[PDB]
């Protein structure tokens, strides 16, 4: 019955070129800016973390060098801006 026209589909079209050329080039720019931003952030963090663990005695050099599973069950409700 109504599987024929739905599967075939109809290519719809209508335009506004204000809605056709808003310059994704700036978009690409600002987005690579943001990503390099957060990358520099994260990498400095990484590096001082490795430094931190380094800065401890052999007690944690053997007891804090291993990646751990205690972070694994880190459930965390995200926001709800209206309590139910």
């Amino acid at each position: 019955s109504l599987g024929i026209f739905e599967a075939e589909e109809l290519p719809k079209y209508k335009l506004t070129e204000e809605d056709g050329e808003r310059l994704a080039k700036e978009y690409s720019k600002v987005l690579m800016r943001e990503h390099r931003e957060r990358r520099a952030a994260e990498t400095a963090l990484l590096n001082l973390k490795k430094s931190a663990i380094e800065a401890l005695p052999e007690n944690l050099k053997k007891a804090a060098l291993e990646p751990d599973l205690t972070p694994f069950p880190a459930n965390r409700g995200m926001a709800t801006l209206t309590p139910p």
Partner: peptide, 29 residues
Amino acid sequence: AAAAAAAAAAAAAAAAAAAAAAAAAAAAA
């Protein structure tokens, strides 16, 4: 792509592909 001119010659010699419905919805408005 080139299928554009392919359909050009197709409508020049023959006519009426699913471009029948295409042009139908395009000529409705």
